[PDB]
Write a protein that holds these residues in place. Structure first.
Motif, PDB file in Angstrom:
ATOM      1  N   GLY B  53       0.830  -1.221   0.000  1.00  0.00           N
ATOM      2  CA  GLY B  53       0.000   0.000   0.000  1.00  0.00           C
ATOM      3  C   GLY B  53       0.856   1.259   0.000  1.00  0.00           C
ATOM      4  O   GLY B  53       0.702   2.088   0.912  1.00  0.00           O
ATOM      5  N   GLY B  54       1.755   1.389  -0.973  1.00  0.00           N
ATOM      6  CA  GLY B  54       2.658   2.546  -1.120  1.00  0.00           C
ATOM      7  C   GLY B  54       3.700   2.580  -0.016  1.00  0.00           C
ATOM      8  O   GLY B  54       4.074   3.691   0.422  1.00  0.00           O
ATOM      9  N   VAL B  55       4.121   1.410   0.470  1.00  0.00           N
ATOM     10  CA  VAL B  55       5.256   1.291   1.430  1.00  0.00           C
ATOM     11  C   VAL B  55       6.185   0.206   0.898  1.00  0.00           C
ATOM     12  O   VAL B  55       5.762  -0.938   0.705  1.00  0.00           O
ATOM     13  CB  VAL B  55       4.805   1.007   2.877  1.00  0.00           C
ATOM     14  CG1 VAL B  55       5.995   0.938   3.824  1.00  0.00           C
ATOM     15  CG2 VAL B  55       3.803   2.043   3.375  1.00  0.00           C
ATOM     16  N   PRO B  56       7.463   0.560   0.635  1.00  0.00           N
ATOM     17  CA  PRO B  56       8.439  -0.411   0.163  1.00  0.00           C
ATOM     18  C   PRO B  56       8.623  -1.467   1.267  1.00  0.00           C
ATOM     19  O   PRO B  56       8.922  -1.100   2.425  1.00  0.00           O
ATOM     20  CB  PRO B  56       9.708   0.401  -0.146  1.00  0.00           C
ATOM     21  CG  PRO B  56       9.481   1.796   0.438  1.00  0.00           C
ATOM     22  CD  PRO B  56       8.032   1.897   0.851  1.00  0.00           C
ATOM     23  N   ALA B  57       8.408  -2.739   0.905  1.00  0.00           N
ATOM     24  CA  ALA B  57       8.355  -3.869   1.861  1.00  0.00           C
ATOM     25  C   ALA B  57       9.016  -5.125   1.273  1.00  0.00           C
ATOM     26  O   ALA B  57       9.386  -5.117   0.070  1.00  0.00           O
ATOM     27  CB  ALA B  57       6.915  -4.140   2.239  1.00  0.00           C
ATOM     28  N   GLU B  58       9.125  -6.171   2.104  1.00  0.00           N
ATOM     29  CA  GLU B  58       9.634  -7.502   1.712  1.00  0.00           C
ATOM     30  C   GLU B  58       8.908  -8.602   2.474  1.00  0.00           C
ATOM     31  O   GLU B  58       8.969  -8.591   3.715  1.00  0.00           O
ATOM     32  CB  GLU B  58      11.127  -7.630   2.003  1.00  0.00           C
ATOM     33  CG  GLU B  58      11.729  -8.875   1.380  1.00  0.00           C
ATOM     34  CD  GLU B  58      13.207  -8.724   1.103  1.00  0.00           C
ATOM     35  OE1 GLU B  58      13.974  -8.836   2.075  1.00  0.00           O
ATOM     36  OE2 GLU B  58      13.570  -8.434  -0.066  1.00  0.00           O
ATOM     37  N   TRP B  59       8.282  -9.521   1.742  1.00  0.00           N
ATOM     38  CA  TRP B  59       7.915 -10.868   2.240  1.00  0.00           C
ATOM     39  C   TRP B  59       9.189 -11.635   2.603  1.00  0.00           C
ATOM     40  O   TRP B  59      10.069 -11.734   1.733  1.00  0.00           O
ATOM     41  CB  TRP B  59       7.142 -11.632   1.168  1.00  0.00           C
ATOM     42  CG  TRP B  59       5.786 -11.077   0.894  1.00  0.00           C
ATOM     43  CD1 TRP B  59       5.319 -10.609  -0.298  1.00  0.00           C
ATOM     44  CD2 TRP B  59       4.698 -10.955   1.831  1.00  0.00           C
ATOM     45  NE1 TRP B  59       4.014 -10.214  -0.176  1.00  0.00           N
ATOM     46  CE2 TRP B  59       3.604 -10.418   1.116  1.00  0.00           C
ATOM     47  CE3 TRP B  59       4.535 -11.266   3.187  1.00  0.00           C
ATOM     48  CZ2 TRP B  59       2.374 -10.168   1.724  1.00  0.00           C
ATOM     49  CZ3 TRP B  59       3.320 -11.021   3.783  1.00  0.00           C
ATOM     50  CH2 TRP B  59       2.257 -10.485   3.056  1.00  0.00           C
ATOM     51  N   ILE B  60       9.277 -12.170   3.817  1.00  0.00           N
ATOM     52  CA  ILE B  60      10.410 -13.023   4.283  1.00  0.00           C
ATOM     53  C   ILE B  60       9.787 -14.268   4.895  1.00  0.00           C
ATOM     54  O   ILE B  60       9.127 -14.124   5.948  1.00  0.00           O
ATOM     55  CB  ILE B  60      11.293 -12.268   5.297  1.00  0.00           C
ATOM     56  CG1 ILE B  60      11.724 -10.908   4.734  1.00  0.00           C
ATOM     57  CG2 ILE B  60      12.470 -13.122   5.727  1.00  0.00           C
ATOM     58  CD1 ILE B  60      12.735 -10.141   5.566  1.00  0.00           C
ATOM     59  N   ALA B  61       9.938 -15.416   4.236  1.00  0.00           N
ATOM     60  CA  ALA B  61       9.330 -16.694   4.674  1.00  0.00           C
ATOM     61  C   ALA B  61      10.417 -17.763   4.839  1.00  0.00           C
ATOM     62  O   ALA B  61      11.100 -18.100   3.856  1.00  0.00           O
ATOM     63  CB  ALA B  61       8.235 -17.138   3.729  1.00  0.00           C
ATOM     64  N   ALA B  62      10.554 -18.266   6.069  1.00  0.00           N
ATOM     65  CA  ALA B  62      11.401 -19.415   6.432  1.00  0.00           C
ATOM     66  C   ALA B  62      10.771 -20.668   5.828  1.00  0.00           C
ATOM     67  O   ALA B  62       9.637 -20.629   5.346  1.00  0.00           O
ATOM     68  CB  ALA B  62      11.524 -19.469   7.932  1.00  0.00           C
ATOM     69  N   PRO B  63      11.471 -21.820   5.790  1.00  0.00           N
ATOM     70  CA  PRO B  63      10.847 -23.041   5.288  1.00  0.00           C
ATOM     71  C   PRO B  63       9.768 -23.393   6.328  1.00  0.00           C
ATOM     72  O   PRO B  63      10.075 -23.245   7.518  1.00  0.00           O
ATOM     73  CB  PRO B  63      12.012 -24.054   5.179  1.00  0.00           C
ATOM     74  CG  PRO B  63      13.274 -23.245   5.436  1.00  0.00           C
ATOM     75  CD  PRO B  63      12.845 -22.049   6.266  1.00  0.00           C
ATOM     76  N   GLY B  64       8.555 -23.768   5.887  1.00  0.00           N
ATOM     77  CA  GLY B  64       7.447 -24.202   6.778  1.00  0.00           C
ATOM     78  C   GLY B  64       6.380 -23.126   6.972  1.00  0.00           C
ATOM     79  O   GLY B  64       5.182 -23.460   6.966  1.00  0.00           O
ATOM     80  N   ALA B  65       6.825 -21.886   7.179  1.00  0.00           N
ATOM     81  CA  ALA B  65       6.048 -20.628   7.133  1.00  0.00           C
ATOM     82  C   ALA B  65       4.891 -20.717   6.133  1.00  0.00           C
ATOM     83  O   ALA B  65       5.154 -21.047   4.965  1.00  0.00           O
ATOM     84  CB  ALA B  65       6.969 -19.487   6.783  1.00  0.00           C
ATOM     85  N   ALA B  66       3.676 -20.370   6.589  1.00  0.00           N
ATOM     86  CA  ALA B  66       2.399 -20.421   5.836  1.00  0.00           C
ATOM     87  C   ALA B  66       2.081 -19.041   5.261  1.00  0.00           C
ATOM     88  O   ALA B  66       2.539 -18.034   5.842  1.00  0.00           O
ATOM     89  CB  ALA B  66       1.283 -20.896   6.730  1.00  0.00           C
ATOM     90  N   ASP B  67       1.334 -19.011   4.153  1.00  0.00           N
ATOM     91  CA  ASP B  67       0.971 -17.761   3.432  1.00  0.00           C
ATOM     92  C   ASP B  67      -0.056 -16.984   4.272  1.00  0.00           C
ATOM     93  O   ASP B  67       0.125 -15.740   4.405  1.00  0.00           O
ATOM     94  CB  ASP B  67       0.435 -18.033   2.017  1.00  0.00           C
ATOM     95  CG  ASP B  67       1.473 -18.330   0.932  1.00  0.00           C
ATOM     96  OD1 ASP B  67       2.646 -17.862   1.052  1.00  0.00           O
ATOM     97  OD2 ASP B  67       1.091 -19.012  -0.054  1.00  0.00           O
TER      98      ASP B  67
END
Lengths: 297, 297
Positions: B53-67
């Motif tokens: 929403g107009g904020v520079p971001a990053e998804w960071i998901a470890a193995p196992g981590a759910a969506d």
């Protein structure tokens, strides 16, 4: 990197100073090293204690390491201390980086079992591996400081006894000179936060139990290198043991051995141990990883 | 758990000196924090840049981590510095420990973007999460230091705006009081290697833009807390910010908020950042994992 390198240097600088404080007391010394040991990789690493031809040992396997590719790992600690526990994290990472299962030896130590108890366990352990039907061409014998010395010793013993030699030998900051006659024992004394001539000669005396300081199997600087398999030697520049690696590398090439020597600028003793937060430690472990594969293929 | 804590404390003491030697030079300060950050978990972590929403971001998901289970993570650095880069490692460990995908915000920083821009990015990022069909009962908003603060301000702002609230909030050594008026600014000043009053009041002034220091969304110790979801607060006993946590915990409890406060003995500011080698680091992260998991079942 450097705030990382500087954490590791103050790390050893403190290990180095609690060392002095233990004095000659060997229970204390053992505790100094055991207190620094963590095993953050434990959760995803398979560990199976095992008797390796009469040597207490542990199979250490990073995920999808091959049963039939094997590092026989010989831990440092001046032939008087260290254990599977102190080196477990480094071994797990070498296993990961190499896709190989490690046999980590709990080899007998001085003063209780002086020279050549360590050498007889290493050889016993290696002969056991062959007994379990692991090809010599699929094994590498690896170790750090004293255990780096024990790698050379072991390969020399095995070659004497005419047992099929392994695919290679990896030495991390190996200790091969019991008297400390290396140029680096003076030119790297400032830079090295933990290994110094006095404490190391003292540890040597304890290992030798008044036997001869130039005995090949105790001081492999003085050993016969002809016919040994390829050797990989990693050593830091900030190390009084620099010239144990330089001299061994020179002498082995002259003897016809295929040697690869890396002198890591600014790195201290067995910097591999700081791998979890020190990028050079994990870099150095990845290089060993690749070596073991390019040797066991 | 002490040779390691001592390495961590030295870590902060080196960092604290490099902070002091930039003066108020914000480019330089931002470089000190980047210097200290590594991302050893990088090889097993899936990282995906995104506009939130107009904020520079990053998804960071470890193995196992759910969506469908998310941590909106809001990094520390006194509202002037820090980044996804500084906190990537801690965030990936929170991802693994909680079995949740995390959204790391590069929220806008003072003095380029003073109070309230961080809070508008935070809430903008939150509403974006909801637009992407992530259920608020499957969200936790987590943050350290300044970002701990920002968690509180974000939940306040969201409640006041009648945006459906997340499952929980998590504050690590949160910065709640812009004037540093807590007993711990005196009782923990010797003990704390990194956060002192002078440097911190002066850093608040940078965030505030000469606006009021009691401003609730800047200093959430002064916010109304009625309505907020459950809070998990972890703080070190060896912290000048200790009483920000105790005061916030006491206000929140009084206002009907389900609050779980842990005071960790001897630990310093955001000791989590040393998880790679510091066992109490990884323990503290393991607990947040378990909290996020139980709060999102």
């Amino acid at each position: 990197a450097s705030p990382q390198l500087q954490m590791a240097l103050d790390g050893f600088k403190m290990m180095g100073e609690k060392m002095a404080q233990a004095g000659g007391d060997v229970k204390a010394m053992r505790a100094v090293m055991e207190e620094m040991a963590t095993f953050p990789s434990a959760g995803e690493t398979k560990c199976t204690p095992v008797n390796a031809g009469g040597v207490p040992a542990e199979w250490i396997a990073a995920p999808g390491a091959a049963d039939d590719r094997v590092i026989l790992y010989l831990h440092g600690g001046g032939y008087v201390m260290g254990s599977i526990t102190t080196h477990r994290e480094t071994i797990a990472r070498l296993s990961k980086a190499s896709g190989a299962r490690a046999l980590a030896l709990d080899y007998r130590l001085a003063p209780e079992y002086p020279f050549p108890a360590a050498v007889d366990d290493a050889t016993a352990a290696y002969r056991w591996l062959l007994s379990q039907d692991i090809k010599p061409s699929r094994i590498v014998v690896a170790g750090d400081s004293a255990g780096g010395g024990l790698v050379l010793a072991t390969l020399v013993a095995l070659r004497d006894a005419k047992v099929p030699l392994p695919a290679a030998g990896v030495c991390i900051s190996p200790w091969a000179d019991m008297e400390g006659t290396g140029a680096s024992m003076t030119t790297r004394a400032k830079a090295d936060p933990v290994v110094q001539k006095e404490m190391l000669v003292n540890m040597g005396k304890t290992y030798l139990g008044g036997k001869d300081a130039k005995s090949p199997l105790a001081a492999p600087l003085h050993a016969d290198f002809r016919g040994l398999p390829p050797l990989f030697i990693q050593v830091g520049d900030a190390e009084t043991l620099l010239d144990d690696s330089t001299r061994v590398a020179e002498k082995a090439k002259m003897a016809g051995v295929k040697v690869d020597l890396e002198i890591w600028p600014e790195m201290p003793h067995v910097w591999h141990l700081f791998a979890p937060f020190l990028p050079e430690g994990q870099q150095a472990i990845d290089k060993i990883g690749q070596y073991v594969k390019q040797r066991t293929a």
